[PDB]
Design a protein around this ligand. Sequence first.
Ligand SMILES: O=C(O)CCCCCNC(=O)CCCC[C@H]1[C@H]2NC(=O)N[C@H]2C[S@@]1=O
Ligand SMILES: O=C(O)CCCCCNC(=O)CCCC[C@H]1[C@H]2NC(=O)N[C@H]2C[S@@]1=O
Ligand SMILES: O=C(O)CCCCCNC(=O)CCCC[C@H]1[C@H]2NC(=O)N[C@H]2C[S@@]1=O
Ligand SMILES: O=C(O)CCCCCNC(=O)CCCC[C@H]1[C@H]2NC(=O)N[C@H]2C[S@@]1=O
Lengths: 124, 127, 125, 125
Amino acid sequence: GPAEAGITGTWSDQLGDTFIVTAGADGALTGTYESAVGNAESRYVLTGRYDSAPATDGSGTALGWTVAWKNNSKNAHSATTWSGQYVGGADAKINTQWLLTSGTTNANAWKSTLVGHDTFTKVK
Amino acid sequence: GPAEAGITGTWSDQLGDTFIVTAGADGALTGTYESAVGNAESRYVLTGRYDSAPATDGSGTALGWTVAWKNNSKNAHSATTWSGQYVGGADAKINTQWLLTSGTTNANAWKSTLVGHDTFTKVKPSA
Amino acid sequence: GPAEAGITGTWSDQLGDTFIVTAGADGALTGTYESAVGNAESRYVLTGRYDSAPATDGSGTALGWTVAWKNNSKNAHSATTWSGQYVGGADAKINTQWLLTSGTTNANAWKSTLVGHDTFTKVKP
Amino acid sequence: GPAEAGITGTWSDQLGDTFIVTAGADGALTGTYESAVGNAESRYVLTGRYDSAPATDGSGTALGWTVAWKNNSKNAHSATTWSGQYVGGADAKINTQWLLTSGTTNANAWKSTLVGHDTFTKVKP
Ligand SMILES: O=C(O)CCCCCNC(=O)CCCC[C@H]1[C@H]2NC(=O)N[C@H]2C[S@@]1=O
Ligand SMILES: O=C(O)CCCCCNC(=O)CCCC[C@H]1[C@H]2NC(=O)N[C@H]2C[S@@]1=O
Ligand SMILES: O=C(O)CCCCCNC(=O)CCCC[C@H]1[C@H]2NC(=O)N[C@H]2C[S@@]1=O
Ligand SMILES: O=C(O)CCCCCNC(=O)CCCC[C@H]1[C@H]2NC(=O)N[C@H]2C[S@@]1=O
């Protein structure tokens, strides 16, 4: 359907953070994420979920995903989740907010979690 | 290792929101989630990731997961993500913040995303 | 100083949400805020704080402010705070994230708080 | 009214973070905040707003405040805002979420803002 065909593909933000994702199986997001910033290099596994039967009446399609920042080259002892929605059109977008939590001692737990926003445009 | 054995099991918060998760395969989380609140009934697929080789000296283990609020009988047109960390011990905890986004019109996108906090405690074998 | 002169003035985001602010007295923000969206009409009181001695290493100036959405026209039983930083130069910006909490019963407290992001540019005049 | 009497006083969280606030003037919060954690020493100025005519259906009272982490002792080049609600009664609480932004260069702006929660209990009228 349109949610599957819309989300599936490659997405990039203004900083060149890029992900490749497949949307299907009635709600699964799978793919890989590459950050252009922070303690990260090369690709990280992405897993998430999306609404596979969205309100078709001008609303976006809700979705989210997770990346743990460990791969074969690096481990940043952190994970990020993005929560947002897919909007179609010529300039299709995934508009999100994100939360990045680092593993901490209990003393530093109050400062464990960064928050931000990320808008992705579809590249292929 | 300890992150896999610590995280895997059954977890619930002060409201009775509960999940069952398995941590393995070098950083995968899979399970089911049940909310006691909101436009939700019964169980929903959970998928996420965790740090499979956490810092060695008393830090928490970073993890996150996602639930889209559609299952076999309900669809709330929304998805939540939880980002947080695991800590072990007898009162093991997963301490998180969450973001819940609804599909909206572009005019209403400014009000699409709720935010909150959720501390889960692991059900012990002694239960 | 630079931070007082830079923050002081009229600011608007892409949606036409607008505020007018004065920065002074070693850290005080005072002004009015007008929202183009939501359960809001006319101008609301804004109060906040800023770092009146910011780093001079190229960093922005931290700041934050609060609006309770009650005025003489409307009461939306809610309040928003913005947390962010000011950056000067010809494309001066205040880049923020915000938290909007509504008064709720305990049963609805779990869904009391919205989050978003807001970038403001300086208006003349 | 009960919002003013309710919110005015001394509050603390589980970590010992404490603020002393006066609520009045049809929606003003004024006082000082002391953190027990982080790059903070002694008392900082607090300014905020609250809903001075809240719903009477059992709902909490929306509120928000800001602290810039500059005082006569220290400057941490950052500001925090708390958005939340006051719930009255015999276990009077202020339940909030917060956003802490540091001034940063543009290279570091992506990591400028921390997020958390804070529940406060009233320790003194
Ligand atoms: O990064 C530091 O050196 C200190 C802050 C602690 C964070 C540790 N983890 C990381 O740096 C992993 C990479 C995070 C990248 C973030 C950025 N890139 C994107 O594509 N979007 C944003 C959000 S994601 O969390
Ligand atoms: O309640 C309404 O109908 C208005 C809010 C619109 C959101 C629609 N989505 C839902 O209600 C799905 C359920 C969300 C449950 C939330 C709550 N339960 C938990 O276990 N933790 C929190 C976060 S989760 O997002
Ligand atoms: O989801 C629902 O049906 C209830 C939403 C509850 C929010 C009630 N409060 C309001 O509508 C007051 C106005 C909020 C305006 C928000 C928007 N305008 C801006 O300039 N920036 C954003 C953040 S501000 O909180
Ligand atoms: O890496 C680090 O050292 C932390 C990031 C830089 C933050 C600098 N600012 C500060 O440390 C000022 C103090 C923040 C205190 C926070 C804590 N205390 C409370 O009462 N509640 C929380 C939120 S508040 O922002």
